[PDB]
């Protein structure tokens, strides 16, 4: 099998949306435009665990173009665009992953991407930690010949760090989830322009002179309540750390708790990541038809299932729009049955997110497989000069114009006129 | 012939939107709370000409509430929603407009609300001036029995004035279009809504970081340069009067000259409402895949024909999305083909827009109808009494609680509790 | 007598001000530009009553600099600054204004500027009214001589419209006081900036964080809200009209009532401009030190006397700044006695805003004068296109690159390609 | 000697002071009202070294309400405010600071803190580094009695690491420098605060419809970014790094070299931190009187030296603002002769984020006091949980409810319900 995808007459259909999402991925294309020719991943088997979208596409032909051997698999499985699958399986790559598998063709599908034609795969790029897991626990005898990995998820990353604690992480790896550049836009950028985009397109409702009430105040919630603010909401917030809670203070935002806030807010949004946010004890005080969706953790930040055993009625407005009938009369509209929003009633994160995450793992890629013996086994940073290189290769698309420490600044600042120009301690 | 809808099996579907639109439409609401009773329209018999969609359903339903004859017929061939077309014509009303229809079926439409079981209309409401065009060039017997008109748009009103003007106008009527209720939402806050929606819905793409430019600082300008603002882009603007410029420049916008800006941006918005806008010799420069879209005047402010008649190729991307190649090399997006791209490309305005302007039909009908000899014929403007009492039907629900002038303070203000509380010359 | 100062001796230091304002006043100096070899006012005697500040001493010139002949006096006792009149007595015009006169001197100095060389003044350019009553009330000869008037105050106004009313008004007059250019900036613009100047400088206190309760949204309101918003601080608005009660709640602000702010705020702003806005009731509620400061009309809308006659201590801490102590052992901040804030417990404007209300003086006297039976007796709104014009005098300064209408487009939207771009009832 | 102050007749106006600004200054407030009664710091003799004002004041007596020994000394000839420094005498403190000294006097004032009445000080409290650094070169004996040190300074903490590295460090430290609510109050919000307080204090001048460039995008750049965006003006700003260059453009700001920029700005402000910002290229190319000031180090980032050398006048309009003439025609105001403008032509940061600042010295001291056998010879971090805790302190005044995690969210998400919230990397 040379792949598995579900329609190859796709293929022409994918090609075009690769080629305009290109022009909004410049971080994959730089990449392509400065080691094309130097193949600097020449040898590397990239064995590819990620949802297998356009944006994941392009990356898949950055890796390609940079002289390595990938094979790819979904880490999702229904996340994957078929006509970006069929186009890579089409473009000579051995891509495994069409919308809707079974927790066993999925498992199938990852396993096919362990061997190729010289040998078992040298390199992971994971996204969830399943290929990394599925090797450790299946596959410890090639083990011993990938060179790194790659994880992008807290989820991922989390693991990384558990088996690694557990002696169990045999193969060092680089956390690129806590880059500056992929956190930042994974988390704040992406979620600030999609937030709306979802609850627009399943309620086309007016945000402004709305009460928005944003549970948590991270990066999700600051780019969900600068989003909300911008439309003309009065966004209240509700955290349980207090440097962050008077980060929203300090910016103009009420911070309240649910238990307050539930009173008063048209709009709820949870940013939590946790557990219980939203119970039936709030949901018999929010006010009629308020619009309460979720976009921190899947499903459970609100108590749906509440929702489902209390309510008089439930009717599906349109597909992720359910309005339930309370029985003190009021009606609350949810969202993507509380799942993510931005994915469950919109497109998701712009590919321009997806080319700051993203490069970052070709970057990822690059070193730890061009240092052979730099990285002992463990979950390592990756190194700030490398986060900083995957922001300069956006500046200019946004046409941004960086200027240059003169070799006397660089001397006063003691610091390279291109190596890092911050601490780790930094935080930007 | 009692109605003429597409298909009135869908009249249930209808409703279903009608009672979901209802609570963001507060105005036609209220206006059922308090006059449902008084029956104020009571006697009066509305031929309505209005894109028959689920707003102007609500309203509908609140002008007959309210005591009044109804006769209706969209205005506009496919501006029209069936469902909610059909859930009126159920719903036991003379609605003529199905989504789609002839110039012939249309004029058709409008004939068939002249005449009501108890004699023929006595009053107008129009959206356009057509109603009140037809009857003047071809039923001017009519005239003379009704008792006044309402008016909501430029378009609209200014053919009245310039009827006026000939003395042709015999029918006083009541300009709704310059409420500050109905044009701040009308033009400044929906626009300011829905722009985005439109741009996202086409091209899913990133706006933080963008450069946008937009033509014109009107109200709608206000709205989408506020909008486009607060989701990280650059505005630029461009205008031709000073008064406008300056307040774009107090508010921190550059403003320039399209022949500049056309370099530089990375979106283009029209809000102008004037020809050649966005020329060729613009197009020729403007960036690699800059999108181009229209939210002022249908379709007359980009030179569409241009790109039509002088690109390499042009490729359909999506309903009202086409991307041409130009000689230089470089790819133009263009959205909804230059018409208005919230309506084109997105849903268009929110309900709550939709609530402020009808409420001003309503108070428009309800006081031409209940004040026989106090309006000459002439275009006249919405006491501000009025408007401002539209406003305070929406406070509320938006949970605003307004304070009331004491005795003494009004006294000291010189002004009534509850009268007017500005001048006509004031400019909120 | 040839004027009146204080001293003289500070001529050379006034002229160092004003020399520097007027990089800051480009509407003035464009004035300059344009007239000062058509000397429009040729032949015009004007007799002005203005502050007299740098600011006003840069129009004086102006008005001289155009070739009329120009007698001054201050229109307040004490808002007159000196080194600002001694340069312009020095200048060799006749100026009658020291700061801190009594109702007596003040009287006699007006008196004196309504006689020249040639003989009685022709002209008026009032802030306030007084120079118009007094020539009214007790030089009803001269009267027959004036072409004109110029009134840039509410106050000036209301008794300009009173005075018609009874017939009393004998000479024409221009009210430049609701233009948009000199509204928006005395009004708005103004007091955005120097709010919290006034307040910084008399309590240094940080703005962030802090609950802002600003009563009334009104221009001064809006500009208010806008500046405390952008430092942080969480804005809750008043109102008693629904109009702007809503334009508030549309950018995201709450609304309430003074009776339930007061217990939340830790700043207060009135912005009224009517009577008993903050009271004793209102007071026993506030936070331990809130600041109460008021910058609508000058000290009616705090209720002072009462926090002198029910606080059980009061100190002043500095110059415009008491912080009584109630009984409830709470402390409560007053600044500038309830005064104007920005006035007495900072500079006041900007020169810029002076620029665009002074070069609409300028507009009006040029035109008044100009066009002799232009204007039959009755207070007028300054044309639109010389309302625009002031406009214009500052882009350019702001760098503002406004693009012209072509025939084409002019002929499209049936407006001249200089001619006012809008009409009367436009509210921008 | 018990102390030595300017004039100790001033305690009685210095306590004023500090009772005002103790309720701006919840953080000590807090520290008081908890541990006063425990006196964690019992036994502790405190050699203080931080500029002697009222703030300052209010954090010594906190210090000695937790049952320490305290001795004081200013860490600047000049920053010493003597009312508040005659007070803490008065308090019974020895306190060794008056405004204006000499290098000769300091370093004996600084020699006083070093001896108590039961022996040498065993506590650091340094802001600067003199007094670690005094005791270190001059004291080698003191060392061994010293528990643990405090520094709140990045040259305090440099020299720190330095001395660490060539083992001169015999008593370890805590670096409180870096604490996200000291450096975010200290940096981002303050200089937000006080930047347009200096501007505004020393020209009066109007900001919106301006271009100010801000170069450096680092905590202080941006908030002096947001500061001035705020007021209206179009900020351009210039970095070296492109992390923070993408953010900035992230967030609509324009990103050019200061070699462009220094064409287009009408204000200037540095907050690099590097030499060689503004040169004499620039100012030549600056337009007319625009105004350029530094907020970042200390006069090195301007290069006033060139603008005396090359001025053709230079003219000191008032303390802190000069104007100098170009050969080119052009005016320059310069502010604070290149100095900090917050500090130098305003009364610097507010209460408030001193009261973060120095909660965080409280903090340390507590803890390495507190913990004897901790801390080994080293400059360390503040623990995150006590950095949330003087975060904590401030909500409250903030009026921001914290809301808890349950046990079941606390097991959920894996950490303490109140233990840290937060991974160490984590930038919020
Ligand atoms: N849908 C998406 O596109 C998308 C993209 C990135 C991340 N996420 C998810 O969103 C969540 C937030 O991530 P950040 O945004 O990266 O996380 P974060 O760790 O920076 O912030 C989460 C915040 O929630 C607060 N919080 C925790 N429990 C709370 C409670 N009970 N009530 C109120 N506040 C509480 C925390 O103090 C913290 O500040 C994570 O689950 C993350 O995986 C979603
Ligand atoms: N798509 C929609 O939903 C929607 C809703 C309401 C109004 N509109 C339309 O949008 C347009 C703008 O309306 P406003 O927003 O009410 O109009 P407006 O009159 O307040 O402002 C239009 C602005 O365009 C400026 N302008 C005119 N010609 C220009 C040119 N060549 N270059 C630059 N600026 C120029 C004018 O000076 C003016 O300030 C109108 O055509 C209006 O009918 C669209
Ligand atoms: N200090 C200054 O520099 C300065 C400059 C210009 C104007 N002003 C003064 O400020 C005031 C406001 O002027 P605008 O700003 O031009 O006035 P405005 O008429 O536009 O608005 C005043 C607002 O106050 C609201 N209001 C009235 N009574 C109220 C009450 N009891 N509670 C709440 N809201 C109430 C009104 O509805 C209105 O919207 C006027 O007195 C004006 O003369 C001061
Ligand atoms: N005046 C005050 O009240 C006050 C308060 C705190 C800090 N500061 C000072 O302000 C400076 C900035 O501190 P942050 O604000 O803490 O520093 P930072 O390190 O976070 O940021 C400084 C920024 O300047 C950029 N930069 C460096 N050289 C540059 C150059 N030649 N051109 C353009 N950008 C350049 C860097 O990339 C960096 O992002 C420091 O010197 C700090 O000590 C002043």
């Known amino acids: 099998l040379p792949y598995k995808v579900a329609d190859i007459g796709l293929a022409a259909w994918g090609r075009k949306a690769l080629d305009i999402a290109e022009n909004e991925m410049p971080g994959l294309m730089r990449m392509r ?12 088997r990239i064995a590819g665990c990620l949802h297998m979208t356009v944006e994941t596409a392009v990356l898949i032909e950055t890796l390609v173009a940079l002289g390595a051997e990938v094979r790819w698999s979904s880490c999702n499985i229904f996340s994957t665009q078929d006509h970006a699958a069929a186009a890579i399986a089409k473009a000579g790559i051995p891509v495994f992953a069409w919308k809707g598998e079974t927790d066993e063709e999925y498992l199938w599908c990852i396993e096919q991407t362990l061997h190729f034609k010289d040998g078992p ?14 090797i450790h626990t299946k596959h410890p005898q090639l083990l011993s010949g990938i060179r790194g990995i790659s994880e992008e998820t807290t989820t991922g990353v989390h693991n990384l760090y558990k088996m690694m604690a557990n002696g169990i992480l045999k193969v060092p790896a680089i956390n690129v989830n806590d880059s500056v550049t992929k956190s930042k836009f994974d988390n704040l950028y992406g979620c600030r322009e999609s937030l709306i985009d979802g609850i627009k397109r399943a309620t086309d409702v007016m945000i ?36 962050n809670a008077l980060q929203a203070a300090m910016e103009g935002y009420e911070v309240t708790t649910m238990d307050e806030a539930c009173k008063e807010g048209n709009i709820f949004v949870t940013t939590t990541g946790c557990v219980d946010i939203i119970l039936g004890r709030h949901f018999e005080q929010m006010k009629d038809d308020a619009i309460v969706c979720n976009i921190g953790h899947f499903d459970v930040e609100i108590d749906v299932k509440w929702l489902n055993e209390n309510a008089v009625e439930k009717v599906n407005i349109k597909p992720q729009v359910d309005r339930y009938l309370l029985k003190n009369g009021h009606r609350i509209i949810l969202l993507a049955e509380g799942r993510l929003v931005n994915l469950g009633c919109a497109m998701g994160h712009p590919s321009f997110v997806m080319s700051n995450s993203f490069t970052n793992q070709v970057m990822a890629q690059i070193e730890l497989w061009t240092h052979p013996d730099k990285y002992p086994v463990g979950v390592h940073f990756l190194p700030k000069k490398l986060d900083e290189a995957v922001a300069e290769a956006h500046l200019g698309k946004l046409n941004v114009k960086l200027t240059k420490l003169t070799e006397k600044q660089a001397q006063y600042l003691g610091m390279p006129i291109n190596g890092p120009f911050k601490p780790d301690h930094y935080r930007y």
């Open 33 to 44: 435009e400065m080691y094309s020719a130097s193949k600097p991943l020449k040898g590397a």
């Open 121 to 134: 795969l040298n390199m992971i790029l994971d996204d969830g930690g399943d290929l990394t897991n599925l």
């Open 208 to 243: 402004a002179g709305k009460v928005a009430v944003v549970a948590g105040y991270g990066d999700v919630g600051k780019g969900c309540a600068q989003a909300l603010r911008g439309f003309g909401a009065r966004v209240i917030i509700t955290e349980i750390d207090p440097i």
